[PDB]
Amino acid sequence: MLEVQPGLYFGGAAAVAEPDHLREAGITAVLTVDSEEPSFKAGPGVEDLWRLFVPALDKPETDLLSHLDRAVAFIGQARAEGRAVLVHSHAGVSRSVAIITAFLMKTDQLPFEKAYEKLQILKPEAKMNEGFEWQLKLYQAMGYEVDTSSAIYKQYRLQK
Numbered sequence: 001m002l003e004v005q006p007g008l009y010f011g012g013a014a015a016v017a018e019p020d021h022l023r024e025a026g027i028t029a030v031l032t033v034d035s036e037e038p039s040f041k042a043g044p045g046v047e048d049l050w051r052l053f054v055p056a057l058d059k060p061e062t063d064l065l066s067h068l069d070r071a072v073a074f075i076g077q078a079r080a081e082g083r084a085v086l087v088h089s090h091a092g093v094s095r096s097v098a099i100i101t102a103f104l105m106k107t108d109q110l111p112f113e114k115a116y117e118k119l120q121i122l123k124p125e126a127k128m129n130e131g132f133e134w135q136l137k138l139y140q141a142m143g144y145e146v147d148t149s150s151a152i153y154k155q156y157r158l159q160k
Contacts, residue, residue, distance in 0.1 A: 001025065002092070002123065007084040008075070010100050011092035019043050028083035031074055033064075033095035050078055050085075058094045060131030063160050065153075068102045068139055069146050075103050093125055098132035105136065106144040112137050 001015040009015075009025065016022070016030065019040050029050035032038055037053040040046045052074040054067040071087075078085045087103075089095035097119055104115035116136075119126050138156070139146070146153060 009086045010096045011088050016088050026084045027086045029078040029085045031087045033089045060129045065135040071099050072103050072106050094128045097126050097128045112140050
């Protein structure tokens with residue numbers, strides 16, 4: 001695991017491996033970006049845990065742009081309701097980061113590279129593939145928002 005802001009963390013397998021390790025941090029909401037949606041062990045607090053699953057792989061033609069709005073609102077509402085959010089994936093380097101960045105970006109209208117920086121800082125390991133990169137870049141343009149009934153969107157999706 002690893003923090004990004006007060007009540008913002010991100011990582012991989014060993015992060016959401018054992019949920020008990022979570023109650024340590026004070027996390028009661030978990031956003032997941034992985035090949036398959038996860039299972040958690042019976043444990044205490046696991047049932048009052050928020051969960052949002054973004055279906056994605058680390059491949060460059062994985063549609064993340066269509067989840068950026070929802071993933072950001074989740075982390076947003078999560079915080080507005082109290083809890084520590086954990087954005088994770090098999091290795092919290094691309095998928096995870098990708099969205100972490102996206103949040104940082106929208107929240108304070110930040111230029112892709114500006115927000116992606118603070119992440120490069122915190123984690124040098126940060127290697128977000130090019131697809132998520134231009135998808136995020138594209139987000140800047142759209143106004144850090146995604147108008148599904150927009151020609152840019154409809155085309156983007158058309159291809160992908």
